[PDB]
Design a protein around this motif. Structure first.
Motif, PDB file in Angstrom:
ATOM      1  N   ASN A  41       0.835  -1.307   0.100  1.00 40.24           N
ATOM      2  CA  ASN A  41      -0.090   0.110   0.007  1.00 40.24           C
ATOM      3  C   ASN A  41       0.929   1.210   0.083  1.00 40.24           C
ATOM      4  O   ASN A  41       0.301   2.264  -0.536  1.00 40.24           O
ATOM      5  CB  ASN A  41      -0.791  -0.042   1.186  1.00 40.24           C
ATOM      6  N   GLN A  42       1.956   1.226   0.669  1.00 40.91           N
ATOM      7  CA  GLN A  42       3.029   2.354   0.502  1.00 40.91           C
ATOM      8  C   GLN A  42       3.224   3.119  -0.828  1.00 40.91           C
ATOM      9  O   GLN A  42       3.000   4.216  -0.974  1.00 40.91           O
ATOM     10  CB  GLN A  42       4.267   2.162   1.311  1.00 40.91           C
ATOM     11  N   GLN A  43       3.710   2.336  -1.621  1.00 42.62           N
ATOM     12  CA  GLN A  43       4.113   2.650  -3.015  1.00 42.62           C
ATOM     13  C   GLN A  43       2.897   2.528  -4.031  1.00 42.62           C
ATOM     14  O   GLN A  43       2.863   2.670  -5.096  1.00 42.62           O
ATOM     15  CB  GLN A  43       5.133   1.962  -3.666  1.00 42.62           C
ATOM     16  N   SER A  44       1.530   2.522  -3.449  1.00 40.75           N
ATOM     17  CA  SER A  44       0.602   2.453  -4.236  1.00 40.75           C
ATOM     18  C   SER A  44      -0.243   4.164  -4.006  1.00 40.75           C
ATOM     19  O   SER A  44      -0.886   4.339  -4.613  1.00 40.75           O
ATOM     20  CB  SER A  44      -0.597   1.410  -3.978  1.00 40.75           C
ATOM     21  N   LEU A  45      -0.214   4.240  -2.596  1.00 39.88           N
ATOM     22  CA  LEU A  45      -0.701   5.553  -2.576  1.00 39.88           C
ATOM     23  C   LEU A  45       0.082   7.026  -3.148  1.00 39.88           C
ATOM     24  O   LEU A  45      -0.282   7.866  -3.512  1.00 39.88           O
ATOM     25  CB  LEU A  45      -0.818   6.127  -0.929  1.00 39.88           C
ATOM     26  N   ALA A  46       1.498   6.487  -3.026  1.00 44.21           N
ATOM     27  CA  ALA A  46       2.493   7.501  -3.604  1.00 44.21           C
ATOM     28  C   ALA A  46       2.175   7.654  -5.313  1.00 44.21           C
ATOM     29  O   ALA A  46       2.496   8.861  -5.564  1.00 44.21           O
ATOM     30  CB  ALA A  46       3.909   6.907  -3.395  1.00 44.21           C
ATOM     31  N   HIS A  47       1.503   6.980  -5.970  1.00 43.46           N
ATOM     32  CA  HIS A  47       1.410   7.060  -7.169  1.00 43.46           C
ATOM     33  C   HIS A  47       0.092   7.600  -7.507  1.00 43.46           C
ATOM     34  O   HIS A  47      -0.460   7.758  -8.745  1.00 43.46           O
ATOM     35  CB  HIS A  47       1.519   5.891  -8.149  1.00 43.46           C
ATOM     36  N   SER A  48      -0.726   7.566  -6.408  1.00 43.26           N
ATOM     37  CA  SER A  48      -2.427   8.111  -6.595  1.00 43.26           C
ATOM     38  C   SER A  48      -2.132   9.621  -6.414  1.00 43.26           C
ATOM     39  O   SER A  48      -1.126  10.246  -6.727  1.00 43.26           O
ATOM     40  CB  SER A  48      -3.071   7.540  -5.402  1.00 43.26           C
ATOM     41  N   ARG A  49      -3.368  10.230  -6.194  1.00 41.21           N
ATOM     42  CA  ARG A  49      -3.466  11.680  -6.235  1.00 41.21           C
ATOM     43  C   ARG A  49      -3.756  12.015  -4.946  1.00 41.21           C
ATOM     44  O   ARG A  49      -4.269  13.286  -4.346  1.00 41.21           O
ATOM     45  CB  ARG A  49      -4.708  11.967  -7.117  1.00 41.21           C
ATOM     46  N   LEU A  50      -2.731  11.511  -3.977  1.00 42.96           N
ATOM     47  CA  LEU A  50      -2.946  12.261  -2.548  1.00 42.96           C
ATOM     48  C   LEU A  50      -1.969  13.438  -2.544  1.00 42.96           C
ATOM     49  O   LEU A  50      -2.126  14.579  -1.591  1.00 42.96           O
ATOM     50  CB  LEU A  50      -2.059  11.332  -1.461  1.00 42.96           C
ATOM     51  N   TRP A  51      -1.088  13.791  -3.398  1.00 47.36           N
ATOM     52  CA  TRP A  51       0.073  14.849  -3.253  1.00 47.36           C
ATOM     53  C   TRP A  51      -0.666  16.231  -3.511  1.00 47.36           C
ATOM     54  O   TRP A  51      -0.435  17.004  -2.803  1.00 47.36           O
ATOM     55  CB  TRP A  51       1.156  14.489  -4.402  1.00 47.36           C
ATOM     56  N   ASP A  52      -1.583  16.170  -4.532  1.00 49.83           N
ATOM     57  CA  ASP A  52      -2.458  17.537  -4.844  1.00 49.83           C
ATOM     58  C   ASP A  52      -3.531  17.635  -3.676  1.00 49.83           C
ATOM     59  O   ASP A  52      -4.095  18.637  -3.537  1.00 49.83           O
ATOM     60  CB  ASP A  52      -2.730  17.518  -6.035  1.00 49.83           C
TER      61      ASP A  52
END
Lengths: 207, 49, 242, 46, 34
Positions: free
Chosen positions: C52-63
């Motif tokens: 899950n760690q490197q799956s949220l990171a490629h998602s749109r959490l950052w914006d």
């Protein structure tokens, strides 16, 4: 791989399908005209008055207080002020119309002052492919609507030849970026420069 | 001649109230802008005469 | 869809001075659901499940956190103007606690110089304008409680109740010149006049020391943990000195 | 005659007691200009 | 074009100049020329 604020971009439509664009005269003939770039092999298209930059991309709720009283990447459903590169003035919708058909459609032009009652354009997606809130991928079919007059900028066809207008009829467009953040003191395309070595002129029949 | 007549009166009574024009609320003088643009004024003179 | 919803609620209230009653309670409902969705987000990540760690990171959490960081640096610098907004400010800051405690656990258990920590820092430099405003806000209300205890203010109190006038306090903080230019009049508007002879620096020093404690705690835990994981980076060296 | 059994209903939707409501008057005119065929064929080009 | 020519009939085969540094048999751009 995306669109970007402060990018020199260029509008493109395709409709007898061809490759068209939007150049503006500036300092005389403020009504915008249309140009084809489908024929680059035998003739150059004069695209140096066809480049638009991007200044503001902000949400349709955020600008009301701006009308009352740096890199923000853009999404669908936003609102965009875009300016002419050479003639330095902003693009806008207008009040009058040279339609000569009572077709209930204004016609675009250019405006000097950025007092933005009418010189703002909002973004819209094409179909159920993408939707509201997603980012803008490069090379996408958009729909531009004015904030003030609430018309679509569309390609007119039935009035003899073809030109742009502002009516209630959907018309896809394009972004097609031509520039980005350049480097310090290098050379790129489209610019103007000298050719020293005491230079390389032409005369004041002048061939 | 009754459909177009009963089209206009709802476009009539959806025009904003006059005390929302003294305040310059941007909807209430751009709704009026679109609503003035649809049917011209001189065409209204031809019906009433 | 919550982020651009409530940020659209901020632009509606950007103009007027105060927030009324019904606008207040609709905003309290707005984040008590947002506290739950952050609490449920971090329990997909709490055990170090790298699936899950490197799956949220490629998602749109950052914006998503960027838009949340934009309203956080503007709400607390507007809700600090009236003594009847404080219980909303008492429950806005702990929401901001409950989003960085997710953001701790996203980068936990990684390698020293990892990519998740490398994409951890570009939000901090993309939102570099409005991470300063929260960083200034933890400076004005922490420098104040050391200034107000110093021996310089006893050369300005004359009233028996310690009611320093606003005309005297302006020259007071200008004398002890640790502050800046425009910040010291923002501090004037954070006090209460009561016919202008009163600022009452007893309560004004510690009205904000309590609720801003633990949110001010773990932002030090961020800027440490980013530093000794990714060292030799110039942009992080342009943060912690603020 | 199909419009005269629709537009009579919209006439009661944006008007109460002689005063015009504003929250409904804005939302109705966005819709019927997003589809111009709600206007007749004399409004497109007669 | 070996002189200047009308822009309305300047073909690619008619005119196509190219910057090199010598003559051997032969997204955003890379920063080459200064």
């Amino acid at each position: 791989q995306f669109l970007r604020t402060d990018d020199e971009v260029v509008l493109q439509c395709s409709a007898e399908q061809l490759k068209l664009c939007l150049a503006a005269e500036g300092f005389g003939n403020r009504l915008c005209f249309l140009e084809p770039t489908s024929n680059a092999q035998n003739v150059p298209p004069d695209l140096a008055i066809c480049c638009f930059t991007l200044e503001q991309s902000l949400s349709v709720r955020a600008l009301q207080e701006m009308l009352a009283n740096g890199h923000r990447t853009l999404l669908y459903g936003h609102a965009i002020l875009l300016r002419h590169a050479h003639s330095r003035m902003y693009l806008s919708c207008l009040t009058t119309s040279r339609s000569m058909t009572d077709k209930l459609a204004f016609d675009v032009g250019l405006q000097e002052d950025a007092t933005g009652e009418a010189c703002w354009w909002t973004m819209h997606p094409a179909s159920k492919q993408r939707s509201e809130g997603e980012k803008v991928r490069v090379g996408d079919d958009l729909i531009l609507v004015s904030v003030s007059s609430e018309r679509y900028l569309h390609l007119s066809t039935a009035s003899g030849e073809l030109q742009v207008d502002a009516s209630f009829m959907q018309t896809l467009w394009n972004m097609n970026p031509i520039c980005s953040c350049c480097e310090e003191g290098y050379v790129t395309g489209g610019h103007v420069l000298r050719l020293f070595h005491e230079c390389l002129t032409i005369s004041a029949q002048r061939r | 001649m009754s459909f177009y007549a009963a089209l206009i009166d709802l476009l009539g009574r959806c025009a904003p109230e006059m005390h929302l024009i003294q305040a310059g609320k941007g909807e209430a003088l751009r709704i009026r802008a679109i609503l003035r643009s649809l049917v011209p004024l001189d065409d209204l003179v031809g019906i009433i005469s | 869809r919550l982020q651009e919803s409530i940020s659209d609620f901020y632009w509606y209230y950007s103009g007027k001075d105060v927030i009324e009653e019904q606008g207040k309670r609709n905003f309290s409902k707005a984040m008590s659901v947002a506290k739950q969705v952050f609490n449920s987000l971090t329990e997909y990540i709490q055990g170090p499940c790298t699936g899950n760690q490197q799956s949220l990171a490629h998602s749109r959490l950052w914006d998503a956190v960027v838009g949340f960081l934009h309203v956080f640096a503007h709400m607390m610098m507007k809700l600090a103007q009236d003594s009847s907004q404080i219980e909303l400010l008492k429950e806005l800051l702990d929401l901001q606690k409950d989003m960085v405690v997710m953001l701790l656990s996203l980068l936990e258990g990684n390698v020293v110089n990892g990519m998740i920590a490398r994409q951890m820092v570009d939000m901090l430099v993309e939102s570099s304008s409005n991470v300063e405003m929260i960083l200034k806000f933890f400076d004005m209300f922490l420098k104040l409680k050391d200034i107000v205890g110093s021996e310089a203010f006893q050369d300005y109190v004359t009233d028996p109740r310690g009611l320093i006038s606003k005309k005297d306090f302006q020259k007071a903080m200008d004398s002890q010149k640790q502050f800046t230019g425009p910040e010291i009049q923002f501090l004037l508007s954070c006090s209460e006049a009561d016919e202008n002879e009163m600022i009452n620096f007893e309560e004004f020093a510690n009205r904000f020391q309590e609720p801003a404690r633990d949110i001010g705690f773990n932002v030090a835990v961020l800027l440490t943990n980013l530093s000794e994981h990714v060292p030799h980076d110039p942009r992080l060296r342009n943060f912690l000195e603020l | 005659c199909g419009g005269e059994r629709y537009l009579d209903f919209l006439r009661f939707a944006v008007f109460v007691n002689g005063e015009s409501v504003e929250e409904n008057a804005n939302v109705v005119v966005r819709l019927l200009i997003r589809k111009p065929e709600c206007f007749g064929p004399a409004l497109r080009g007669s | 074009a070996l002189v200047v020519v009308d822009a309305c009939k300047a073909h690619t085969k008619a005119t196509s100049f190219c910057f090199r540094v010598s003559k051997e048999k032969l997204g955003m751009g890379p920063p080459e020329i200064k």
